[PDB]
Design a protein around this ligand. Structure first.
Ligand SMILES: CC(C)C[C@H](NC(=O)[C@@H](O)[C@H](N)Cc1ccccc1)C(=O)O
Ligand SMILES: [Zn+2]
Length: 866
């Protein structure tokens, strides 16, 4: 399995300008005929090298002449002695029914569908499977009419006929040149929700949402979100849809969440199907996000695509930035910013400290599907947001406009995008480009001084990025560091120096620098790195009272929540050391009081109150420690929950009851009150046992929506309440026929604090609703245990590791892309104590000796064992 290197990029020897595909479709045996119009660019003696995986070649013709100057090798068809321009015809067979890996053409229940990104099209036919080759596709599909009445591909429906023996065919044509990763085909029998969107310039777009028969009742919300996404992209970015049809197909069997195939998105049905009794507020907001995200790729990804896969972040970071802007504009900006920062600090930082650490533009890749990461996505989007911060909205939109103007119709690079932002704005981004090529999280250390005699405040800011496995050399970055200074009244002190205003976004571009502010009439309380202005670790010696002052006075809701996190961080760390010495929780009175004040603040946005009253996850808590103690973290989280439930019992029950809502609305103000109410419930579940059991049981049974019912069930599990087993059994009996709803239940089982959690998880491998054939079920049961129950996964007897090895031994052959998502908890071994590393190392060595080890797992295992 060979590494590929970004510095090896070379323009292709041949282009394909047009491809005409014919699928004679059958689950056991599909015959693909592919007629491509090719043009030599390279040396006249260069062979055409086509990618192909698991393809049965039937014939090779060049201008209709059967070709003798070719050979097959590992993953390729090499064709020699070609004219400068020619028609390539390939005929080959593939077998959808045998495709367990779910890449290329496969079976989803009774449907046939495709997944081609990153390199899945070479599983369908021999092709230039590289994103800088853009061709105009036309696609004829021939299939059994009763089994596949709907035959879908990208673009517009240009031809159709019937044939003998109950077959029919449809031809599609997509006028936009595309890399083959954007190719899609779907065959099956669906219910179809149809609607329309009229674009701002009056183009009328048929919207079509394909769902399994019987699911039309779960489709309107995805349709609404689609129109919302199209409207928003017009208002915010000035971007209109460019075709006449927009199709989305919800499939149950899918390795990822969704895919932006031009004019024909394929979606995991998890990101389509919602009804108020099956779906939570979080599902609704996720559907909106993911619908919007694939929609936004129509421009940032499709109209302008990626020159090579090392440029992935060019589309993913930028499209994540967009879906965050969408969610934030439509919903609560503060809650969105808070949650995206949780993800950054709790999940992405961990990856940047891992053996899989990489720059947002990687330099080296063995298996490209291994790089659809928190780094390329979430940190990518933080980098885009820093550009936005440096340029401001107006110049940022100008840089978007110049980007499309220069690159519409072509495959571009990260550096092109930076270049467009830089030229449109006249902001210098040459230093800034270092964020693309350097991995690891910078640590920004702040020291301050107030001088009463000169009324000057001085910040001495430094930065370093520790070395990572992949990079021995590190250099300072261009770090936009936003500050605000508060006087004793909570008023913002104007920033200025020598009689002139100073931008509150400081340019931290050196290893060490000093910033001096004048006319600081009172010793300030600083808010630092406001709105998480650079993806960095902040090191500043806060006092508790600086932090409670910020919770009370900071202008932006994000800084209030962030202050609360810095306050908690101190006491999480205190109490994990205590836990390790056998000592019970200790928390000063004035900390509990900051949280009492939040509960009883009548002016606070409930959306903000709810986030402050949501404790860091065990994953955000882990990132406060060099060496992770997963059991101490888990138990301290619980003890902190119990302590606050006891100290704030009366205030919690009052705020819980005050936020009752008899109507269920998917509306942001209602979501916010319900999130606060359920945050109050979480603590109440951990107070006095009889009261808790009554409250939780009652909520589960009286809920008129899945949000309140799951919140209850999930508190029953978390606090191991007496009602737990009956409620869990009831949900099983009601919902077992419905995989997406049962995924919620598998997650709760997988993340239970019960002593016997692993025994229960293993038994659930035999559950009526579970199957190894379904990525959703695998992730919900096995992935949630290994990744979201660190206390049990890291049981000291090493039983967690052995369990995962067993599962990955299966999945390595069945579905390597899911195997490689699931191995991730094991590759974090260097973060754990020496006894744990030794057991995890041993598990990894077991996996490395597997016969037919997939490249997907090979890459991670070898970096981890190094
Ligand atoms: C980031 C989210 C909004 C959803 C996310 N999907 C995407 O990013 C799509 O735009 C990707 N282009 C789909 C993808 C993901 C992983 C591997 C190959 C292809 C997914 O998880 O599928
Ligand atoms: Zn994407």
């Amino acid at each position: 399995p060979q590494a590929k290197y970004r510095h090896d990029y070379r323009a292709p020897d041949y282009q394909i300008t047009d491809i005409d595909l014919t699928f004679d479709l059958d689950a056991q045996k599909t015959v693909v005929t592919a007629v491509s119009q090719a043009v030599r660019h390279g040396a006249s003696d260069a062979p055409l090298r086509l990618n192909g995986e698991d393809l049965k070649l039937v014939s090779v013709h060049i201008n209709d002449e059967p070709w003798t100057a070719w050979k097959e090798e590992e993953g390729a068809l090499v064709i020699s002695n070609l004219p400068e321009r020619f028609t390539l015809k390939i005929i080959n067979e593939i077998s959808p029914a045998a495709n367990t890996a779910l890449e290329g053409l496969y079976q989803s229940g009774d449907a046939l569908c495709t997944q081609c990104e990153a390199e899945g099209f070479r599983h369908i036919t021999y092709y230039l499977d590289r994103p800088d080759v853009l061709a105009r596709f036309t696609t004829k599909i021939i299939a059994d009419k009763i089994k596949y009445p709907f035959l879908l591909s990208n673009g517009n429906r240009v031809a159709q006929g019937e044939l003998e023996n109950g077959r029919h065919w449809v031809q599609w044509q997509d006028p936009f040149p595309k890399p083959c990763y954007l190719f899609a085909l779907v065959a099956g029998d669906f219910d179809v929700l149809r609607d329309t969107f009229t674009t701002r310039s009056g183009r009328e777009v048929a919207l079509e949402l394909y769902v399994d028969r019987g699911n039309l009742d779960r489709a309107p919300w995805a349709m609404t979100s689609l129109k919302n996404s199209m409207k928003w992209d017009e208002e915010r970015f000035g971007l209109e849809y460019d075709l006449d049809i927009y199709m989305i197909v919800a499939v149950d069997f899918f390795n990822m969440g969704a895919m932006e195939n031009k004019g024909l998105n394929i979606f995991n049905s998890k990101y389509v199907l919602a009804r108020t009794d099956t779906a939570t507020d979080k599902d609704y907001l996720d559907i909106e996000r993911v619908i919007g995200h694939e929609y936004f790729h129509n421009w940032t990804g499709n109209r302008v695509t990626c020159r090579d896969w090392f440029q992935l972040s060019l589309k993913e970071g930028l499209t994540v930035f967009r879906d965050q802007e969408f969610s934030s504009d439509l919903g609560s900006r503060a809650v969105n910013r808070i949650n995206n920062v949780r993800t950054m600090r709790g999940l992405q930082f961990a990856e940047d400290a891992s053996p899989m650490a990489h720059p947002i533009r990687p330099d080296m890749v063995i298996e490209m599907n291994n790089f659809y990461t928190l780094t390329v996505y979430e940190k990518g989007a933080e980098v885009i947001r820093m550009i936005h911060t440096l340029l401001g909205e107006e110049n940022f939109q100008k840089g978007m406009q110049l980007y499309f103007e220069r690159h519409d119709g072509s495959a571009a690079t990260c550096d092109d995008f930076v270049q467009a932002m830089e030229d449109a704005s006249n902001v210098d981004l040459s230093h800034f480009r270092r964020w693309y090529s350097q991995s690891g999280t910078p640590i920004v250390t702040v020291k301050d001084d107030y001088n009463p005699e000169t009324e000057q405040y001085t910040l001495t800011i430094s930065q370093r990025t520790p070395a990572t496995p992949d990079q021995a050399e590190k250099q300072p970055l261009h770090i936009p560091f936003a500050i605000e200074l508060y006087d004793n009244e909570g008023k913002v002190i104007p920033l200025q120096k020598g009689g002139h205003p100073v931008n509150s976004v400081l340019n931290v571009t050196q290893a060490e620098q000093t910033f001096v502010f004048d006319n600081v009439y009172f010793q300030p309380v600083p808010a630092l790195l406001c709105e998480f202005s650079a993806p960095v670790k902040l090191e500043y010696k806060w006092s508790d009272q600086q932090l409670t002052f910020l919770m009370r006075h900071a202008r932006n809701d994000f800084s209030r929540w962030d202050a609360a996190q810095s306050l908690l961080a101190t006491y999480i760390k205190l109490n994990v050391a205590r836990h390790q010495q056998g000592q019970p929780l200790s928390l000063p009175v004035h900390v509990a009081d900051a949280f009492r004040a939040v509960l009883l603040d009548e002016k606070i946005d409930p959306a903000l109150a709810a986030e402050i009253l949501t404790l860091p996850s065990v994953n955000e808590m882990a990132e406060l420690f060099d060496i992770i103690d997963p059991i101490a973290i888990a138990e301290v989280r619980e003890a902190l929950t119990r302590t606050l439930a006891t100290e704030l019992a009366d205030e919690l029950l009052a705020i819980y009851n005050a936020n009752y809502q008899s109507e269920y609305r998917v509306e942001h103000e209602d979501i916010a009150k319900r999130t606060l109410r359920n945050a109050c419930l979480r603590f109440l579940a951990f107070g006095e046992t009889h009261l808790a059991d009554v409250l939780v049981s009652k909520q589960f049974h009286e809920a008129n929506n899945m949000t309140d019912a799951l919140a209850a069930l999930s508190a029953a599990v978390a606090a191991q309440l007496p009602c737990r087993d009956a409620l869990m059994q009831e949900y099983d009996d009601k919902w077992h026929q419905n995989g997406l709803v049962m995924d919620k239940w598998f997650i709760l089982q997988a993340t239970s604090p019960a002593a016997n959690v692993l025994e229960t998880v293993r038994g659930l491998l035999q559950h009526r609703s579970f199957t190894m054939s379904n990525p959703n079920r695998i992730r919900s049961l096995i992935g949630a245990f290994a990744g979201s129950n660190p206390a049990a996964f890291h049981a000291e007897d090493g039983s967690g590791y052995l369990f995962l090895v067993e599962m990955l031994t299966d999945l390595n052959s069945r579905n390597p892309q899911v195997a490689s998502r699931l191995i991730e908890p094991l590759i974090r071994l260097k973060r754990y104590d020496a006894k744990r590393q030794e057991k995890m190392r041993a598990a990894l060595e077991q996996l490395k000796g597997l016969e037919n080890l997939s490249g997907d797992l090979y890459e991670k295992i070898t970096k981890a064992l190094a």
